[PDB]
Amino acid sequence: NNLALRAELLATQIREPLNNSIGVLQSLTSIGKSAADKEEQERMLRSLFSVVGGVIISGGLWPEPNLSATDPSLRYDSLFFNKAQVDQLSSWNNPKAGGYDRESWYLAAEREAEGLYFWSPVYVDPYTRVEMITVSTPYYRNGQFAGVATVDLSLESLIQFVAATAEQYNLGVNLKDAFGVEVVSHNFRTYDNALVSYYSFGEFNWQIEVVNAN
Ligand SMILES: [Cl-]
């Protein structure tokens, strides 16, 4: 019944939103590493999030904060965009609210080597209210860590894509993330010695188990 082949076909599709997110992150880091000023970066980021598709829903640039600045509005200067049209949000730069430099997705990438990517736990962004997984990476300027870039994946969009693809291939699938959270479970069950095909994504530390659908 070609289960292993169809499971590989499904894994290739599941890899697409994740490879897509990595590519967008590479574009974000190019912008963060550049000599463009704040307004030029805002324009490029707005354009970038306007053209990207798939499961990508928000993200942007998170400069290393200056917590010692006397003006509270100068401490945090993230460039964060949300795909509704594309809106720029300032909500994460609220000094009263702790800023962003202690968030899991910032800390994972902080001062890490360029070219490494980090995947957050599932969470609901407190300002866009979208349930999401974030991929992040550091960027540098003049040899020094300068900030974190992020891309947010819509969990709802990811679920729909994986389930619809598995249905098309007449498969059931469970997809778990690196924290053991069940991202998607679509028509998956085992009985009467049903074969299960397992695949581990080596770059993302995610896991799928696949069965034939009846
Ligand atoms: Cl689900």
Numbering used by the authors: 44 to 127, 131 to 260
Reported in the publication:
The canonical V. cholerae quorum sensing circuit is controlled by four histidine kinases CqsR, CqsS, LuxPQ, and VpsS. As anticipated based on sequence analysis, our structural studies confirmed that CqsRp is a double Cache domain, which is the most common extracellular ligand-binding domain in bacterial receptors, including, among others, histidine kinases, methyl-accepting chemotaxis proteins, phosphatases, cyclases, and phosphodiesterases.
Electron density corresponding to ethanolamine revealed that it binds to the core of the membrane distal domain. The ethanolamine binding site consists of a hydrophilic platform and a hydrophobic lid. As both ethanolamine functional groups are chelated by Asp198, this enforces a higher energy gauche configuration for the ligand. When ethanolamine binds to the membrane-distal Cache domain, it triggers a reorientation of residues in the binding site.
